[PDB]
Design an enzyme around this catalytic site. Structure first.
Site, PDB file in Angstrom:
ATOM      1  N   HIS A   1       0.970  -1.285  -0.192  1.00 29.20           N
ATOM      2  CA  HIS A   1       0.104  -0.120   0.007  1.00 29.20           C
ATOM      3  C   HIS A   1       0.944   1.308   0.063  1.00 29.20           C
ATOM      4  O   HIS A   1       0.374   2.203   0.411  1.00 29.20           O
ATOM      5  CB  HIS A   1      -0.886  -0.007   1.051  1.00 29.20           C
ATOM      6  CG  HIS A   1      -0.336   0.110   2.472  1.00 29.20           C
ATOM      7  ND1 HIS A   1       0.200   1.363   3.024  1.00 29.20           N
ATOM      8  CD2 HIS A   1      -0.244  -0.857   3.496  1.00 29.20           C
ATOM      9  CE1 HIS A   1       0.707   1.092   4.135  1.00 29.20           C
ATOM     10  NE2 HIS A   1       0.683  -0.071   4.473  1.00 29.20           N
TER      11      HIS A   1
ATOM     12  N   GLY B   1       3.094   6.314   9.910  1.00 26.38           N
ATOM     13  CA  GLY B   1       4.493   6.087   9.433  1.00 26.38           C
ATOM     14  C   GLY B   1       5.254   5.084   9.751  1.00 26.38           C
ATOM     15  O   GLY B   1       6.534   5.173   9.551  1.00 26.38           O
TER      16      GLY B   1
ATOM     17  N   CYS C   1       4.670   1.788   9.025  1.00 24.96           N
ATOM     18  CA  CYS C   1       4.258   0.762   7.987  1.00 24.96           C
ATOM     19  C   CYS C   1       5.914   0.588   7.781  1.00 24.96           C
ATOM     20  O   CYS C   1       6.662   1.329   7.485  1.00 24.96           O
ATOM     21  CB  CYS C   1       3.392   1.285   6.971  1.00 24.96           C
ATOM     22  SG  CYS C   1       1.727   1.624   7.514  1.00 24.96           S
TER      23      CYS C   1
END
EC number: 3.4.19.12
Lengths: 306, 306
Positions: free
Chosen positions: B41, B143, B145
């Site tokens: 993503h 942030g 991820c």
């Protein structure tokens, strides 16, 4: 969001841990520049541990008596000096992985991550704090000496702890990188007990604000209390006297959640006289005093509305 | 002595963390050899997490769109591939800090260390467990991820988790390094939620086993109960049924202890009603279930990792 007892990334410290051996004793050392730091009781045996004369043992020792191992490569010792209770072994080659560091002597109540090591290799990393009695409730086994504690600010590693011994009660005691012990402890084999371990009041309050962010807002009271009403009355299980310096650093957490610092102190007055019939707080059951007000904001990057 | 919830030394992992940027979203990535792994993503701006076509966006986007950045030097991507739910970027040069890595998938019950990263820079490391509902009660912010979970055997890093999203219930879900999610979750943000969470029975016994290895003795007794009747109260309460293999895994914990696996069942069925008439149970007066038996022996021994 979530909230957990995190530790600093120990990567910068792993590159400095080495193995130090003197005769039959083997423990860890901190390799910084061309100096290797380690506790001074590495030059001692079992017979002379009752009242060791480190000055006599240090002078009569030699450079090749110390076997410094950086992983698998051996380091050559060119000189040895003693600063208080830490041994400084000067090597021929400087550590290329030396990070920007500093020696900070923290006060009781502050947190720091520890890097447990055995034979110079790192085993694990955990977060903890010095108890009011100048001890830590870490986890160490034989050969853990040299395991350092540290904080990382911006990008500089601020060392603060140097493990030495373990009290008969189970807790642990150590020094700073300058060699000064934490508390009424000395590195010799004698009847030496710990002390009265109270509770870090300021950390408890901060841990409450951390819970309020992640839900859990059922322990808010609407009856603030003064200073003596929180000391001469709220000290049934020993809690550190809160000072006007604690409320200064608790400002950001107060203006963020909206609960006044004095108002939060009243919340503990209700829990310290009752408790819970099974209702959990955030995650644990008993108040956790291992989170400083700086650790909460560090992990709960919330906004403070003004 | 002492027993802390330690995490693995994250040094070997920090050297693999980079900052992946595509469009306006920036998340973390794992740099191993000349390949960079990050959540799929990243190619989806904050306006497509509903039902976006990935194989269409991947072939549409070229190499100039991505922007991988290490500590201070920016990398150059050549090939971009999507394996399940991980966006693989084949960069120019290989990571000289690549450790002997390994992609393993863990079943609910096992533990691992998480290295929290933001903008490709680690910030914290903590130890958690894969919940029975295929989630983790970690600590992540926007942030984060790309942050990976890992275990270390000695010289080998066993990556097992990569954070992708947070569920509205507070917990976090992710995938392995093959890109397969843990549980019935999807990368496209919808009204998905996790199932009911249960307590790991084998981990509580493994944790209660370490309490005796340490020295805590007050909640012990002897009222034998085989593998048949204990499952009755385990399912009626909120606990995972103790399977048959769980007993064989507790074998090594009984060798250097001598206590029968079926003996501690009498002590657990009583601490679920009267409360904590004793409080001190190795710290934290509650049932901890984030200590797998394979990691209880490593902390009660001294197993190091490079």
């Amino acid at each position: 969001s979530g909230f957990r007892k995190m530790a600093f990334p120990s990567g910068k410290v792993e590159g400095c841990m080495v193995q130090v051996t003197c005769g039959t004793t083997t423990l860890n050392g901190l390799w910084l520049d061309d100096v290797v730091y380690c506790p001074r009781h590495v030059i001692c045996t079992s017979e002379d541990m009752l009242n060791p004369n480190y000055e006599d043992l240090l002078i009569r020792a030699s450079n090749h008596n110390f076997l410094v191992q950086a992983g698998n490569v051996q380091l050559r010792v060119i000189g040895h000096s003693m600063q208080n209770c830490v041994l400084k072994l000067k090597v021929d080659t400087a550590n290329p992985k030396t990070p920007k560091y500093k020696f900070v002597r923290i006060q009781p109540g502050q947190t720091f991550s520890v890097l447990a090591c055995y034979n110079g290799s790192p085993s694990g990393v955990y977060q903890c704090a010095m108890r009011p009695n100048f001890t830590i409730k870490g986890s160490f086994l034989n050969g853990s000496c040299g395991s350092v504690g540290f904080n990382i600010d911006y990008d500089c590693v601020s060392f603060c702890y140097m493990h030495h011994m373990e009290l008969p009660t189970g807790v642990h005691a150590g020094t700073d990188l300058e060699g000064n012990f934490y508390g009424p402890f000395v590195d010799r084999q004698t009847a030496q007990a710990a002390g009265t371990d109270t509770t870090i009041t300021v950390n408890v309050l901060a841990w409450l604000y951390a819970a309020v962010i992640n839900g859990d807002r059922w322990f808010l009271n609407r009856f603030t209390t003064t200073l003596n009403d929180f000391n001469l009355v709220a000290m049934k299980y020993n809690y550190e006297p809160l000072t006007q310096d604690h409320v200064d650093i608790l400002g950001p957490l107060s203006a963020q959640t909206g609960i006044a610092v004095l108002d939060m102190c009243a919340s503990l007055k209700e829990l310290l006289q009752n408790g819970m019939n099974g209702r959990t707080i955030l995650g644990s059951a008993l108040l956790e005093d291992e989170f400083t007000p700086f650790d909460v904001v560090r992990q709960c990057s919330g906004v403070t509305f003004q």
